[PDB]
Amino acid sequence: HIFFEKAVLEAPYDYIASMPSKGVRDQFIDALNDWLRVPDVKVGKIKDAVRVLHNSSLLLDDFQDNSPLRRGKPSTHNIFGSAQTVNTATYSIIKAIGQIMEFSAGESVQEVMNSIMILFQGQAMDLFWTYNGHVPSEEEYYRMIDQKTGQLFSIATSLLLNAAIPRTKIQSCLHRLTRLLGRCFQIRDDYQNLVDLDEGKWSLALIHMIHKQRSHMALLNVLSTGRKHGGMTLEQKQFVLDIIEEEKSLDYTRSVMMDLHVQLRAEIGRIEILLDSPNPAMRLLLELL
Amino acid sequence: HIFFEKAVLEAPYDYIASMPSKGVRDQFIDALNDWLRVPDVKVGKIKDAVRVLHNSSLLLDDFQDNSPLRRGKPSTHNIFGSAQTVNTATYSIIKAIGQIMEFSAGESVQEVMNSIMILFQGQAMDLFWTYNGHVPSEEEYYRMIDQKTGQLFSIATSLLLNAADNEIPRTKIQSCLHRLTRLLGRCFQIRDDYQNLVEDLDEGKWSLALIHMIHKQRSHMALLNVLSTGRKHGGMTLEQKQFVLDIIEEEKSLDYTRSVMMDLHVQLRAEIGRIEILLDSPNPAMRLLLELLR
Amino acid sequence: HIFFEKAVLEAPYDYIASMPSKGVRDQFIDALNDWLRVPDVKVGKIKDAVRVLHNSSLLLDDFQDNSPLRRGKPSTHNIFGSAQTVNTATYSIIKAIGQIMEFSAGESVQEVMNSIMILFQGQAMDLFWTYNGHVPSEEEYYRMIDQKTGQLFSIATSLLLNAADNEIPRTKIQSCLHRLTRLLGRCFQIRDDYQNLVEDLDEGKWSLALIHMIHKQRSHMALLNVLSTGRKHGGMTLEQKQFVLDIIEEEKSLDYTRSVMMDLHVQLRAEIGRIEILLDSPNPAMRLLLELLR
Amino acid sequence: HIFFEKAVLEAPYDYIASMPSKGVRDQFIDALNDWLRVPDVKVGKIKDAVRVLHNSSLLLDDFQDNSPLRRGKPSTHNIFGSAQTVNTATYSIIKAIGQIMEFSAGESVQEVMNSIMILFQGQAMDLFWTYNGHVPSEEEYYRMIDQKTGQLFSIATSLLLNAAIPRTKIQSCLHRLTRLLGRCFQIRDDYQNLVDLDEGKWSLALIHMIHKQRSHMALLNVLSTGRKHGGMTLEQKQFVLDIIEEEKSLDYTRSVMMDLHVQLRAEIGRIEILLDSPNPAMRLLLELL
């Protein structure tokens, strides 16, 4: 009937939903709801909207990096074919927009529309630097990371500032905290995924090493010419392993995390002092990293 | 520099922005404008957004059906890779959705996006059939063709009408126009099909001819089993493809779509004459659009 | 010398003539003899012909499902090649049909072959489903299982009864016996299935479990799409196979066949008690046959 | 319904039937009906029975020699898979037996049952000599050929002698003509198929050359060791081509045909003189070769 055509379109989403999600986009909102304090009948709807947007982000990601198994279960790219996964991810983002064009928000449609166009620009960069071997710089890797991960919490917050009653004075001093939390969470996720293979999959633990001016040019010319001629040899695979240990990129991630925290605990304090009410939970949210 | 990011993202959509489309969406919009009588500023922004949706559908369709040379240049999938064109298409769809929002919000645009998710339910039906091999019926196949090809004309008309003049009959012509759009989209899909079989796409997709043959009790088993061996071996043969061409030549397949195209053509002709009697004047453009369908 | 031709033809069937079958057709025939009370010359020729049909079905089945090690030796397909085992199987089927003709022709044997062509309509249904991927229903799946596994027991019983004693109730027990055969064959197929899932055959075939899952609206799409990708890539994975095992563990699949096996077991038990009241004495062998079904 | 399960089993047969059959098994019976003169309501049934038996023979053959295209259209082995073609060929022979267990014949069931067991023995030999490289001898190749082709006309005639009224005096002097016509027709078919590739596909035009004691041992050792090590080289493929020309196997087929004819025209004469009625058609049947 109609339920058939409706449950076949939403089948890949129904497969990615049953995954044991970390529950951060649904906890950051629960921690941001301590300050903004929107009604439950609305915060739940916004949580649903950011949840479908993020699950569709995973749907596009798990295909945009060919991986038979993402975590525990097999990857949607490897179960429903590839054409089905793409044609359901696109429908899912449009459905989330229509969910945002509703009670989620009325007049600031351009606000979330632009904050989604940023989310796709910050991803095209990753696909470009992987498909074209064009190694980045930290001034651009941090740009991309904040252009692809933080642009989800940005929509998550820009819709909670459209419902929550002071003024937008917090905005300029609230977005900052959003982008900071987003970058730190991506960095923590990369760290846990590391503790390696290349094949066009950059990270902080690689943009710090491939720019270490000691043995830098050896690196900028080891990946290439080998990634063309097959993939890599066997002593070369150990070479970069021992190279990452040299300057200890794995410790620059620790240092940047030790700076994102002390940047968070001074950025949360801005909100804690703007509104005269502590937040015994958002300070505990930092246990994520 | 954003000047570079904003041009690596748009790069795929720019690659088929200049392809020789020989499209008809433009002619249909310039023919509906003969009735709606909207300012040229409007008929410009509408074409400059429905063309984005169309080219985005091309990226999204001409990639699942991995093709080679298209008009002298290879398919956008093989050049920019699969992962990059998908991201550019998902962005370009949102770019057009944002373009729509700007021109108008009165009379609601929550029914202009609810008319795009239908354009993806249709493609979802098609990509579920071609993948899981489930043969369609005849009514279900017509439903998918209406959902997938005609829905883009439906978006264009539902955006045109929403800023038509604020005069005119308004709603008293809306449902009639929507029926005209459905029949016109169905004809323009079925005509490209009948031109393809004058076949060559037996690698997975489902034309109306295939729906005619697989449903006739004579040789129904044979054709069903041929498609299964094809999808099992990834392409049938140059010999088995000649067998399917001979089934088409046997069951009078090129005579059953013609008897459907020539029927939908007279139906569209009756529909257009019904539009010229609903507080409207002649449209020698629409009757020149039907001539572009053999 | 014919001594060589007559031994290269019989060579494949002789290769599984000594395989450790652990079969049950013999036990069932020796249990039906407890009722029919036929001369041992009969109960010998019957087993020496229904065993030929069974081993021939093995050649014909264990070849389409190209397998490797079977009981410590490879499948008869890989040793003698596909073309040679098929010819030996088609000959051995006719050898058993000719064997049947000899023992008896009164009461007609034109209904003993009409009960073998059913055993091939069943296998034809199975080889059309596994090939063209058409999912079965539940009643159609039970029909195929009755046609394919139970029909060999039906041949044995319709040959036993046709020379049962010329005394006995005769026809007044024929239809009851035929219902007993159908239920017993269905149980012995479903039990081998439930033992296979304590799975490992997701390369094309269709167990009852697969018919339970693909029919439940929850995750019906997921499982259908997994089987399509499997049959498209020729085998799914070691990862996707674990996904199907987790669906089985989720939808309570190993609890729905058990609720069907334990139902068919009580049904068979009631049927056997109904046979002991139809001018017959106890059969402590039949009630020891049911114990060989967990 | 029931028509479904009935038309799926008989679908491969329905595909091999639409082929443009030569129409020999339905013409040999029409030419044998001149002497025996059975009723039409019976000769048609026997023609149907031998037609399904022969179409099932083709079904097993076209799979037992892997060929994507037999003639004009594609091969049943390459359309319905392989498991379907086998499981319909077997059903077709059983159905033909049941058609023979009827009006076709009543009491002489063993006659046609044995004449079908011979038809499968005469084929197992071919599959053995192909699957095992065991080159035959003419004393065995003629045996196999008469054991595989003539055993169809044999059933075609043994059922017309079960309906047709003299005695079985003709039998012993009628079977001979059947087997002679069967061998000559197979030889004519092989000749037309030749006027080559090996891969275990013997013929008269090969059993005559691979036994030509001049260059014989070179042949018995050229095929093997090469058919294992890949297939063949490029000068070797021309070698046997020029070898067949040497002794002219292609002319021993002509000589054996020039003997089968003069053997036929003296075997048909036996029937022509036994019953005092000429046959202006069976003499014209010989135009097949």
Numbering used by the authors:
A (entry chain D), D (entry chain H): 414 to 577, 581 to 611, 624 to 717
B (entry chain C), C (entry chain G): 414 to 611, 623 to 718
Q: Please, what does the article write about this entry?
A:
Cryo-electron microscopy and chemical crosslinking experiments additionally show that compact conformations can be achieved in which cyclase domains are more closely associated with the prenyltransferase core.
Initial two-dimensional (2D) class averages calculated from cryo-EM micrographs of full-length wild-type unliganded PaFS indicated a mixture of apparent tetramers and trimers with an approximate ratio of 90:10, largely consistent with results from negative stain EM. To our surprise, three-dimensional (3D) reconstructions from cryo-EM data clearly indicated that the tetrameric particles were in fact octamers of just prenyltransferase domains. The cryo-EM structure of the prenyltransferase octamer was solved to 3.99 Å resolution. Each prenyltransferase domain consists of residues 414–718. However, the Hα-2 and Hα-3 helices that partially cap the active site differ in monomers A/A’ compared with monomers B/B’. Thus, the octamer can be described as a tetramer of dimers. All active sites open inward to the central pore of the octamer, so substrate access to and product dissociation from the prenyltransferase domains is achieved exclusively through the central pore. The more notable structural differences are mainly the Hα-2 and Hα-3 helices that partially cap the active site, which pivot outward in the octamer compared with the hexamer. Curiously, the cyclase domains are not apparent in 2D class averages and hence are not resolved in 3D reconstructions of the prenyltransferase octamer.
